Amino acid sequence: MEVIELNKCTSGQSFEVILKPPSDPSLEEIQKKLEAAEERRKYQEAELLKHLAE
Amino acid sequence: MYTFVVRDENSSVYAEVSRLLLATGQWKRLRKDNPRFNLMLGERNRLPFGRLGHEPGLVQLVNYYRGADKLCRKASLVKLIKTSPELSESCTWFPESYVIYPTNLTDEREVFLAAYNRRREGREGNVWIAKSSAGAGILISSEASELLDFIDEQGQVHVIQKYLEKPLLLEPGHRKFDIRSWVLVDHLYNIYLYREGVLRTSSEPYNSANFQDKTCHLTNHCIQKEYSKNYGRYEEGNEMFFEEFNQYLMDALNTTLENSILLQIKHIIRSCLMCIEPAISTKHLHYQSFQLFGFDFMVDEELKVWLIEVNGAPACAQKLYAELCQGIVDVAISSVFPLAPTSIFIKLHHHH
Amino acid sequence: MRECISIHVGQAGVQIGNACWELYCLEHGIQPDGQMPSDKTIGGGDDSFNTFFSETGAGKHVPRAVFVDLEPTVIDEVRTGTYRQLFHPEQLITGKEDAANNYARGHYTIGKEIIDLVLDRIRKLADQCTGLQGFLVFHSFGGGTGSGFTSLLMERLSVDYGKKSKLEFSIYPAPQVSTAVVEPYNSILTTHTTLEHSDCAFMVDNEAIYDICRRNLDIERPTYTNLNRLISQIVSSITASLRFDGALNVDLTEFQTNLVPYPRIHFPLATYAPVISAEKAYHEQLSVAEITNACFEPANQMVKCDPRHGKYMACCLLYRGDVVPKDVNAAIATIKTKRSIQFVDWCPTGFKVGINYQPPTVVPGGDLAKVQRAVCMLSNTTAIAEAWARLDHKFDLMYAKRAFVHWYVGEGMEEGEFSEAREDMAALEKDYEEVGVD
Amino acid sequence: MREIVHIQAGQCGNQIGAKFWEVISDEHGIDPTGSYHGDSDLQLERINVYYNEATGNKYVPRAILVDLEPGTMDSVRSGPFGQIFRPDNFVFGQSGAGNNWAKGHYTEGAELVDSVLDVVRKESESCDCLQGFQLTHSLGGGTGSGMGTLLISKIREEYPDRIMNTFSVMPSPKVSDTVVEPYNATLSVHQLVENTDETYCIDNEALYDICFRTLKLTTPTYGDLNHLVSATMSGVTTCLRFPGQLNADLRKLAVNMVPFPRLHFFMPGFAPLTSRQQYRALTVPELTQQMFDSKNMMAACDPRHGRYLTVAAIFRGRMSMKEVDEQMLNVQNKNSSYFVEWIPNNVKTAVCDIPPRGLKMSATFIGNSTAIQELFKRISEQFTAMFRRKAFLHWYTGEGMDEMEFTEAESNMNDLVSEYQQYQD
Ligand SMILES: Nc1nc2c(ncn2[C@@H]2O[C@H](COP(=O)(O)OP(=O)(O)OP(=O)(O)O)[C@@H](O)[C@H]2O)c(=O)[nH]1
Ligand SMILES: Nc1ncnc2c1ncn2[C@@H]1O[C@H](COP(=O)(O)OP(=O)(O)CP(=O)(O)O)[C@@H](O)[C@H]1O
Ligand SMILES: Nc1nc2c(ncn2[C@@H]2O[C@H](COP(=O)(O)OP(=O)(O)O)[C@@H](O)[C@H]2O)c(=O)[nH]1
Ligand SMILES: Cn1cc(C(N)=O)c(C(F)F)n1
Ligand SMILES: [Ca+2]
Ligand SMILES: [Ca+2]
Ligand SMILES: [Ca+2]
Ligand SMILES: [Mg+2]
Ligand SMILES: [Mg+2]
Ligand SMILES: [Mg+2]
Numbered sequence A: 001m002e003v004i005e006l007n008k009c010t011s012g013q014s015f016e017v018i019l020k021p022p023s024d025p026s027l028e029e030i031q032k033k034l035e036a037a038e039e040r041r042k043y044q045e046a047e048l049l050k051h052l053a054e
Numbered sequence B: 001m002y003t004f005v006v007r008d009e010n011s012s013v014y015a016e017v018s019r020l021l022l023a024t025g026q027w028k029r030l031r032k033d034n035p036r037f038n039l040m041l042g043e044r045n046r047l048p049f050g051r052l053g054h055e056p057g058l059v060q061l062v063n064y065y066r067g068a069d070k071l072c073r074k075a076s077l078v079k080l081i082k083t084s085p086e087l088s089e090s091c092t093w094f095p096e097s098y099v100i101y102p103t104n105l106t107d108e109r110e111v112f113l114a115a116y117n118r119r120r121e122g123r124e125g126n127v128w129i130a131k132s133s134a135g136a137g138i139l140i141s142s143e144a145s146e147l148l149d150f151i152d153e154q155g156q157v158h159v160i161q162k163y164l165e166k167p168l169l170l171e172p173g174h175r176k177f178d179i180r181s182w183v184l185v186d187h188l189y190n191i192y193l194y195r196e197g198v199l200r201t202s203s204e205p206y207n208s209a210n211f212q213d214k215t216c217h218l219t220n221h222c223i224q225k226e227y228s229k230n231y232g233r234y235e236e237g238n239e240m241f242f243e244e245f246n247q248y249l250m251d252a253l254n255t256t257l258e259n260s261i262l263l264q265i266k267h268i269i270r271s272c273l274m275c276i277e278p279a280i281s282t283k284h285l286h287y288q289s290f291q292l293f294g295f296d297f298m299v300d301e302e303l304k305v306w307l308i309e310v311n312g313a314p315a316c317a318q319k320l321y322a323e324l325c326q327g328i329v330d331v332a333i334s335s336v337f338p339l340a341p342t343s344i345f346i347k348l349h350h351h352h
Numbered sequence C: 001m002r003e004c005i006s007i008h009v010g011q012a013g014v015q016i017g018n019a020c021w022e023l024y025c026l027e028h029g030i031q032p033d034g035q036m037p038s039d040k041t042i043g044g045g046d047d048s049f050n051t052f053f054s055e056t057g058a059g060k061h062v063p064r065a066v067f068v069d070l071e072p073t074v075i076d077e078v079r080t081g082t083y084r085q086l087f088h089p090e091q092l093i094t095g096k097e098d099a100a101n102n103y104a105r106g107h108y109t110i111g112k113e114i115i116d117l118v119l120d121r122i123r124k125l126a127d128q129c130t131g132l133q134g135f136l137v138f139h140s141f142g143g144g145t146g147s148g149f150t151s152l153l154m155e156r157l158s159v160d161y162g163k164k165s166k167l168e169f170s171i172y173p174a175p176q177v178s179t180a181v182v183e184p185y186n187s188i189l190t191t192h193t194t195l196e197h198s199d200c201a202f203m204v205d206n207e208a209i210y211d212i213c214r215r216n217l218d219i220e221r222p223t224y225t226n227l228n229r230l231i232s233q234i235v236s237s238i239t240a241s242l243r244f245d246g247a248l249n250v251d252l253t254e255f256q257t258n259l260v261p262y263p264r265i266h267f268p269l270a271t272y273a274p275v276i277s278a279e280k281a282y283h284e285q286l287s288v289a290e291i292t293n294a295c296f297e298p299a300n301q302m303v304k305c306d307p308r309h310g311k312y313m314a315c316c317l318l319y320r321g322d323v324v325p326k327d328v329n330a331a332i333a334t335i336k337t338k339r340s341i342q343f344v345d346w347c348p349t350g351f352k353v354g355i356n357y358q359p360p361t362v363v364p365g366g367d368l369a370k371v372q373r374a375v376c377m378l379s380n381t382t383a384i385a386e387a388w389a390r391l392d393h394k395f396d397l398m399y400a401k402r403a404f405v406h407w408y409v410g411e412g413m414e415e416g417e418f419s420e421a422r423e424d425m426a427a428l429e430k431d432y433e434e435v436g437v438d
Numbered sequence D: 001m002r003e004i005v006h007i008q009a010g011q012c013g014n015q016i017g018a019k020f021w022e023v024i025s026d027e028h029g030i031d032p033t034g035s036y037h038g039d040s041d042l043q044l045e046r047i048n049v050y051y052n053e054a055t056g057n058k059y060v061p062r063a064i065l066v067d068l069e070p071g072t073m074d075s076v077r078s079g080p081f082g083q084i085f086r087p088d089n090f091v092f093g094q095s096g097a098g099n100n101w102a103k104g105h106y107t108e109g110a111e112l113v114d115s116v117l118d119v120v121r122k123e124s125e126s127c128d129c130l131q132g133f134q135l136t137h138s139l140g141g142g143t144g145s146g147m148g149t150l151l152i153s154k155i156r157e158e159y160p161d162r163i164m165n166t167f168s169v170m171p172s173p174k175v176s177d178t179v180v181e182p183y184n185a186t187l188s189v190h191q192l193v194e195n196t197d198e199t200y201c202i203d204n205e206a207l208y209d210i211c212f213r214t215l216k217l218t219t220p221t222y223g224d225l226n227h228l229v230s231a232t233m234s235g236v237t238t239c240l241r242f243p244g245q246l247n248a249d250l251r252k253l254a255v256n257m258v259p260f261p262r263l264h265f266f267m268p269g270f271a272p273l274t275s276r277q278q279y280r281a282l283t284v285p286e287l288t289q290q291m292f293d294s295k296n297m298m299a300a301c302d303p304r305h306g307r308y309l310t311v312a313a314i315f316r317g318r319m320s321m322k323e324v325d326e327q328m329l330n331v332q333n334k335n336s337s338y339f340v341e342w343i344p345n346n347v348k349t350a351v352c353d354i355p356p357r358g359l360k361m362s363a364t365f366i367g368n369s370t371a372i373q374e375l376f377k378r379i380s381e382q383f384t385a386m387f388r389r390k391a392f393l394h395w396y397t398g399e400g401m402d403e404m405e406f407t408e409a410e411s412n413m414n415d416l417v418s419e420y421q422q423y424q425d
Helices: A027-053 B012-023 B074-083 B109-121 B144-152 B221-227 B242-253 B257-280 B318-333 C010-028 C073-080 C082-086 C103-109 C111-126 C144-160 C183-197 C206-215 C224-243 C252-259 C288-294 C325-338 C382-399 C405-410 C416-436 D010-027 D071-078 D101-105 D108-125 D143-158 D181-195 D204-214 D222-236 D250-257 D284-292 D321-334 D370-387 D403-424
Strands: A002-009 A012-020 B002-006 B027-030 B039-041 B097-100 B128-131 B139-141 B158-162 B177-185 B191-194 B198-201 B239-241 B291-299 B305-311 B345-347 C004-009 C053-055 C061-063 C065-069 C092-094 C134-140 C165-172 C200-205 C269-273 C312-321 C349-356 C373-381 D003-009 D051-053 D059-061 D063-067 D090-092 D130-138 D163-170 D198-203 D265-271 D308-317 D347-352 D361-369
Touching: A002 C325, A012 C325, A027 C103, A027 C111, A027 C144, A027 D143, B002 B012, B012 B027, B012 B039, B012 B318, B074 B097, B074 B158, B074 B305, B097 B109, B109 B144, B128 B144, B139 B144, B144 B158, B177 B257, B177 B318, B191 B257, B191 B318, B198 B221, B239 B242, B242 B257, B257 B291, B257 B305, C004 C010, C004 C111, C004 C144, C010 C061, C010 C065, C010 C073, C010 C082, C010 C134, C010 C144, C010 C165, C010 C224, C061 C082, C065 C073, C065 C111, C065 C144, C073 C082, C073 C092, C092 C111, C103 C111, C103 C144, C103 C183, C103 C405, C111 C144, C134 C144, C144 C165, C144 C183, C165 C183, C165 C206, C165 C252, C183 C382, C183 C416, C200 C206, C200 C224, C200 C252, C200 C382, C206 C224, C224 C269, C224 C312, C224 C349, C224 C373, C252 C312, C269 C288, C288 C325, C288 C373, C325 C349, C373 C382, C382 C416, D003 D010, D003 D108, D003 D143, D010 D063, D010 D071, D010 D130, D010 D143, D010 D163, D010 D222, D063 D071, D063 D108, D063 D143, D071 D090, D090 D108, D101 D108, D101 D143, D101 D181, D108 D143, D130 D143, D130 D250, D143 D163, D143 D181, D163 D181, D163 D222, D163 D250, D181 D370, D181 D403, D198 D204, D198 D222, D198 D250, D198 D370, D204 D222, D222 D265, D222 D308, D222 D361, D250 D308, D265 D284, D265 D370, D284 D321, D284 D361, D321 D347, D361 D370, D370 D403
Parallel strands: B002 B027, B002 B039, C004 C065, C004 C134, C065 C092, C134 C165, C165 C200, C312 C349, D003 D063, D003 D130, D063 D090, D130 D163, D163 D198, D198 D265, D308 D347
Antiparallel strands: A002 A012, A012 C349, B097 B158, B128 B139, B128 B158, B177 B191, B177 B198, B177 B291, B191 B345, B198 B239, B291 B305, C053 C061, C269 C373, C312 C373, D051 D059, D265 D361, D308 D361
16 A cells, blocks of 8 residues: 655645556548448449439 | 246256146246246356346346355365355364366466375375366275376366365264255355255275275265175165164264254354355345255364365155155245245354 | 646537536636636736636736537537637537437538538637646437547547547436436437547536436426536536645646546546535535445445445545545544555555535525535446446447438448447446456 | 428328428417517527528528418418418419329429529528428328429439438328329339438328327328328427427437438327317326327337337426436336337437427427338239239329339338338348
8 A cells, every 4th residue: 555656736636556566540540431332322323413404 | 927937947946836836736847948938947158147136126146156066066165165264274174175277288286285294294194085076986095196196187176185084983883974965045145954854875984094985985875785794784775864863873972963063163163164155145135046055074083173165956755755846936936936843954144 | 737628419418518617717716707807917927827817908808718518509509608708600500400419410411521620720729828727528328429520539639639648527327307318318329439439538417416416406307507516516526626825736747647447438426515405404514435435325426336346446535625634644544444445456445535625615596505525436437338238228229220220321420330339339348247256 | 400391292292291290380489470579589499490590589480381282382372381481482284193103203393493493402402501401291192292202303313311200191091192102102202212311101091090099180181191291390490490409400309210221210108198188288208108009109000019119209308307207217127029129229219308289298209110011011012913904004104104214112011011121020
């Protein structure tokens, strides 16, 4: 039961008590992900319009 | 209308409990994967406790205490007894035990040999038994070399504990036996002891000069019914019930089952269960738990009781399935889900 | 002094953000018009509260906050509410139609068209910071914006502000206050794509905040206002060290250092006590030992789970009010001898303690009663994995039938991102078990 | 500002639509002349969803009235609230459809559809942010059935990413105008399977039995049936017409009610349904028990013959929201065998403080149940009974249709039935 790093100021204090010792994607790659999904949406809408045109 | 699910098809106990619940006309069984249940008769292994108590408007109850394995595992019980201040120091009712890991994997090998060499040097009886939870795989021997070498040939954790060389022998027969007590713990953590126990007796005379033939030393019901030649001679199915056993203690020893054995059993059940209560209690939990336990005891010729092990998913004696299962429904299930005596249990009061 | 920018995304984040800044103002003595009589340096200063507030030449104290929602109705509350004067229009961003509880819609379809605008508004706040620490991101798991747009925002922040820390305050989905069936989908999608971008995340399970409100505050059917006022109390306790003088958790970096030794396991469990009803006659004031002991009761945890069957990697005790170190150590010694507190063998069995003498501020007319001392415990337990298990299981039930999947594919998401996200959660669950179970 | 454009086509569509605008106009305080005279701000909060605001604080419904003969729409224009509709929004021909799907869809209707889309386009151009469309019509006639589905097909082409919603009256032999109603209904259903996000299935037989057996009306009329549709239409749209986070807009409701794109046909329900003992206060248990009772449902399908994919319940009036959750959670936990177990929490509840006119409290029911297949089975059986003998086909081949198109519709709906069956197990 040891207390370490006791710091005191006007608004409070903090310390540490030890009981026992131990034993990314780039900007380019994000645009591609967004543009890839935007293309899959454009493809699926074209197939809908092609279906409606028939 | 209450709802329950069945997730252990091999449980003869809760199979009968499930049959009784439907007999009341106020409980309905659902598919085993339906989460909208009041009661879960769960699986033995890997029961998903984390998924309980998160259904809006449903009080959920389960038939197992999460964390009770600490008591029902051979190696866990030994570690729990030795490390718990409530037990280790003054635990005079549990045989001297040691946890031993096979050399192909803490470990109490050296501590075991130290106590072994002390007995061998003092002329004292030095017969130990090695067992594990992965058995049907038991060996009894008086040589440390054989015990340790038998564990290295396997691949799971084992426990070496003192073998009771002076057991109490029934007469006529001169035969060993053990005592099985069923204990029910409800959601409020009351400890109920079934008034009916069973002595699983050996139908062979106890022989202290030959630990090779393990039929007169192991009182398991399956071993007696497979490797014993006098099965069913003295009592039906090698099962003597308290009424007869009590009458015997009066005729032979001039004492009663209560005074000479039951007090110690009730004391041991309390000590074990109160010890782990802070770790497994569901008093302030989002779900509730109860569980049936099977305690196994040994009795020596001084009428001192010893704890062998605790079973977390015990079976029951055929003659007592109806009475006990109905009891599980009265105090364990209907106490939380009431329906629209002379209790068969004995409440062991204690401080929570 | 280093600044902290708070970002509020979606209905949950915005409304919780509104409740926190209401509490921050009451704590720092800031009026609804932005004035602060106690601040003697007019139009400037590098005080602790300046980490969350900037100053204008007229003496106004403006939160370093951005509010983002793909629909304008929730942010219109902020624009015309009590604290309307605090923020300027550049800080409030609203679209015209939401993500319809569809992660793919908020992340891809709608997010792609508004992401550059949000980054620009955030860049304007960053340009007022002389040494920016990082970001606090508030959002829900279930909302299509909270889940879908947040994960995109996090990816870009990692690119635009590489060396900056990012903490989260995430609302775990609870059916008692939800009408969305697909929230498990959104929760798991957003955890997958956000995991490598968040340094530390505090999950709050609405189920926990709900029962606390019914049990402790005697509210039969709590509203979001009740939940959010309680939630912002916990948030205040967690961010207090950044806004007041002190030496524990004085910057966002310290949260990771003190609470997350393993980067993926960055979800500390939060426990708060005491929560007392204001409608009560008058309560007996609880002691240091009693409130500290409450920190190990499941009933006051932000996520319901059983820490008795996990392992602790870190443990932080944040007290506010009349507390002295002597009383804290006394209580801890008692709890150790009674409770089941198992640490991992590669971490010290210790407690970092912080004490702020100013007791918890309570919103006038709110539901919480004034107390003389309170504590928030931050502990990294493997027990919080139960939350992932519950969530992952609901995911498995719907995905086995591909139910509702077409709504996501329709917005341009590939079906494979479902399984890719799920396999990540199965790996996350394995990490918890490798650290906690024997 | 999330506006909805309403369309009503054909005899049935306009008479039901007429009463719908009569009911909600009363609930929002709008009088027959468009002036607001309510006493609560909740009435105007979401008023712009169904009403445009004109000069002088006038509220004009965002509704388009369509038909191929003038008769019915002259009745509307002379009806109680006829003056409230925009005069330009009446688009009608003179030939009629003769209860013929091919005339509404291919010949007569084709000549008139473009001018209908000119009005739709004009109402959408004035929307701050259009949610989507809702169409009221019957499937058994020619205009609402044949031209209605033609409208949907062209509205989806010009507005491919908007929500298309319909209230569809299914024909029943017990309440029938002509024997060709199964033909028209089968042809329309396939259009709806493809081009609608949500379809409330209303069976004229269920409406009849309710008026006779429950309401004790010796001789029901179309007007009596339309009173139920009104109340129901007012109920399902309560989420959209008043403040609330649950089922906020049309796309959010669809995301939570439709697990598979083709299984978007709902069974609606209402409660109470009291006969003239009409002043008795109704308790929350009674509201919930009735709302889930098949007798209170309007698709004429027994829910205990299938399983609920998702359920959405709306409670109106000043009541105990706690007692609502308890009773809802009571019904689910008491019959969890009719709720699929692979969609956690598929039963959602919403509350609203403004009750319908003349009621202390009420509840509306919206179910996506696999039992709806029984409705399509009836239609298919009736279709096939005549088609195997090519009975009455000349009415349709005379309009340019081929037998091959009927065979496809037959298969398309039989596939629709098989899709429901595989999810019921
Ligand atoms: N604690 C709390 N939870 C909220 C609040 N508002 C919404 N939620 C929860 O958030 C989830 C729904 O997500 P939202 O935040 O409303 O969705 P969103 O981020 O606005 O995204 P959209 O789909 O576009 O609306 C549900 O689980 C709600 O219970 C709130 O004010 N406080
Ligand atoms: N230390 C000891 N001294 C004497 N006998 C012992 C003993 N340990 C075990 N036994 C004998 O072994 C038998 C049961 O062994 P154990 O209970 O360890 O195996 P097991 O768990 O597979 C049977 P069960 O679980 O049904 O009680 C008992 O009947 C007892 O007679
Ligand atoms: N509920 C209801 N159903 C109607 C009404 N009028 C007609 N129907 C039904 O609708 C079908 C006839 O369609 P109808 O609207 O007359 O054809 P249309 O004018 O060409 O669109 C038949 O099945 C009728 O039973 C009505 O006022 N109310
Ligand atoms: C064919 N038909 C049925 C009904 C009815 N039962 O209500 C009417 C109505 F016009 F009277 N017509
Ligand atoms: Ca200053
Ligand atoms: Ca990073
Ligand atoms: Ca012509
Ligand atoms: Mg055993
Ligand atoms: Mg939203
Ligand atoms: Mg007609």
